[PDB]
Amino acid sequence: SRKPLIAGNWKMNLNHYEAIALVQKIAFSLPDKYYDRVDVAVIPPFTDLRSVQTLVDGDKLRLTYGAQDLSPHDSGAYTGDVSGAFLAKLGCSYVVVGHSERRTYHNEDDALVAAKAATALKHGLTPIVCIGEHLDVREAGNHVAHNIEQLRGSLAGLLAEQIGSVVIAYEPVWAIGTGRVASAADAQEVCAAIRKELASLASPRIADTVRVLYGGSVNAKNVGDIVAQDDVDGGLVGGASLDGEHFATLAAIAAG
Amino acid sequence: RKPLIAGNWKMNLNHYEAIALVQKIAFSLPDKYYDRVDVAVIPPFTDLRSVQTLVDGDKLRLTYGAQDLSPHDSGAYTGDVSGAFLAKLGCSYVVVGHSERRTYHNEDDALVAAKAATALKHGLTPIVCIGEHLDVREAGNHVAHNIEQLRGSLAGLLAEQIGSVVIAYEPVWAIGTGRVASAADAQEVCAAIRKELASLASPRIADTVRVLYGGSVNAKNVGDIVAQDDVDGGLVGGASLDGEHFATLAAIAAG
Numbered sequence A: 001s002r003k004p005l006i007a008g009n010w011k012m013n014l015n016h017y018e019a020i021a022l023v024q025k026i027a028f029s030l031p032d033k034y035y036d037r038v039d040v041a042v043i044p045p046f047t048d049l050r051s052v053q054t055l056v057d058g059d060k061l062r063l064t065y066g067a068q069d070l071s072p073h074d075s076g077a078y079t080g081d082v083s084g085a086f087l088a089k090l091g092c093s094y095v096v097v098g099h100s101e102r103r104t105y106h107n108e109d110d111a112l113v114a115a116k117a118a119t120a121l122k123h124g125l126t127p128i129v130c131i132g133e134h135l136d137v138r139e140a141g142n143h144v145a146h147n148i149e150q151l152r153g154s155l156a157g158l159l160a161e162q163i164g165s166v167v168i169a170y171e172p173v174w175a176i177g178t179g180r181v182a183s184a185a186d187a188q189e190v191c192a193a194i195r196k197e198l199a200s201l202a203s204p205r206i207a208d209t210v211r212v213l214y215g216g217s218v219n220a221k222n223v224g225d226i227v228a229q230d231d232v233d234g235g236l237v238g239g240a241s242l243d244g245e246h247f248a249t250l251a252a253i254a255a256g
Numbered sequence B: 001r002k003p004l005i006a007g008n009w010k011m012n013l014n015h016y017e018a019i020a021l022v023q024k025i026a027f028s029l030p031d032k033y034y035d036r037v038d039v040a041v042i043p044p045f046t047d048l049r050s051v052q053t054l055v056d057g058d059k060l061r062l063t064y065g066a067q068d069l070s071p072h073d074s075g076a077y078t079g080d081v082s083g084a085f086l087a088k089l090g091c092s093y094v095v096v097g098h099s100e101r102r103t104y105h106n107e108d109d110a111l112v113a114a115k116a117a118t119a120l121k122h123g124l125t126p127i128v129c130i131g132e133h134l135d136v137r138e139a140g141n142h143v144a145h146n147i148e149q150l151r152g153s154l155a156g157l158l159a160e161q162i163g164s165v166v167i168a169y170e171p172v173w174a175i176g177t178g179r180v181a182s183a184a185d186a187q188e189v190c191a192a193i194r195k196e197l198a199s200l201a202s203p204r205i206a207d208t209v210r211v212l213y214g215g216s217v218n219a220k221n222v223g224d225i226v227a228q229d230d231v232d233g234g235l236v237g238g239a240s241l242d243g244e245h246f247a248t249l250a251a252i253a254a255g
Helices: A016-029 A032-036 A046-058 A084-089 A100-105 A110-122 A135-139 A145-154 A184-201 A223-227 A244-255 B015-028 B031-035 B045-057 B083-088 B099-104 B109-121 B134-138 B142-153 B183-200 B222-226 B243-254
Strands: A005-009 A039-043 A064-067 A094-097 A126-131 A167-170 A212-214 A234-237 B004-008 B038-042 B063-066 B093-096 B125-130 B166-169 B211-213 B233-236
Touching: A005 A244, A016 A039, A016 A046, A016 A244, A016 B083, A032 A039, A032 A244, A039 A094, A046 A064, A046 B045, A046 B083, A084 A110, A084 B015, A084 B045, A094 A110, A110 A126, A110 A145, A126 A145, A145 A184, A167 A184, A184 A212, A184 A223, A223 A234, A223 A244, A234 A244, B004 B243, B015 B038, B015 B045, B015 B243, B031 B038, B031 B243, B038 B093, B045 B063, B083 B109, B093 B109, B109 B125, B109 B142, B125 B142, B134 B142, B142 B183, B166 B183, B183 B211, B183 B222, B222 B233, B222 B243, B233 B243
Parallel strands: A005 A039, A005 A234, A039 A064, A064 A094, A094 A126, A126 A167, A167 A212, A212 A234, B004 B038, B004 B233, B038 B063, B063 B093, B093 B125, B125 B166, B166 B211, B211 B233
Antiparallel strands: none
């Protein structure tokens, strides 16, 4: 079986002092025994990464961490942009690519996401490749096909072994600011289809190892049902990731 | 006006390369120069903690800043960095509207103006970048175009706020086109920039605003450029990555 993964996307929240406090609160709140049964990661803003590295390395913490984006390039004249080389030197394990907020606010397309995923892998990072359909598509009853095309586009050009080194996150964008709610069954339908397509793009053996996360609204009341699904391997968590006790509770539920 | 030499590192140098570069600059620049020139480094976001702790821990006279910020204070903007985070890390400056962000990242004058306002709300000094393309320069319309871009990039700011920005002129028309901007070219545009700042505020307030040259700066041209009446220093590119070379630029600007 695939070991569950609870990854906390902090989004654009928490200065470096607050980052230090949150990581220490998570470490204090989550009993050690749970790490054998769940992988736990925090995903802070770029400016918080060195601070988190110091704690994780100095306290030998079992939680891991990552960043929220990276450039498709390794270096150069890209004012404001952050390289996967920098993230690797900071000890990041993960990097989020193609989050729906970047697709909306920064016009990121599937081809760019695929290029970012390849660059992440070049630097030894595990990209968390985010996909998911919007309200109109969901309303058309297209629960699967649009997601499959977006998966194909966002992994375009990756070798089979590279696909075995990514994480996928399904964001039900149709359930963001619309009033709609995505059930655990809804998550299972899409994640099962994602895995079947991964088996085609890579191999059945490889696809059985790839962690596919749910990236809709995850909280203490719903995380158990989500991770209980056959093809859902954890969560890319939003706002709950900012509260150390709540986030620890999510990890504990996912573990047990 | 006290000159300013600000080093835009762009997407270069990891966090322990960042410490070494700052120490190289501090090693290379005699302390007597700081009374005569402000010197700032502008590293990638991921280097800011390392630079902040070095600068604060060793009481360095160098200051630092960041290369971008969100127009928003916080929230659901995955990947983006807030001016609040920059302020808490002791940044003095933040670059807004660099040509690379305008082109690669679809930033228009309105977004630049929003970022400039947000920078000010967090006590940061925005370095507001403007500059015209070759077609505009060839048509002889470079002065007017820069003034319009300035006005658009400062939209919403009132007289008292004008005194808290820095402007940088990037002669984009000379980037990778083979053309070379002269000290005279820099002066023509920077004079027009100051005239517009005076209209948005007053000649006195405009006379406190540093207006930087953001074209190619090296030891052989920096003197002529900073010697110009309306040019107050440089937003330096590649030379900012060599501590010796960068310190030399600061020493020349100090006069």
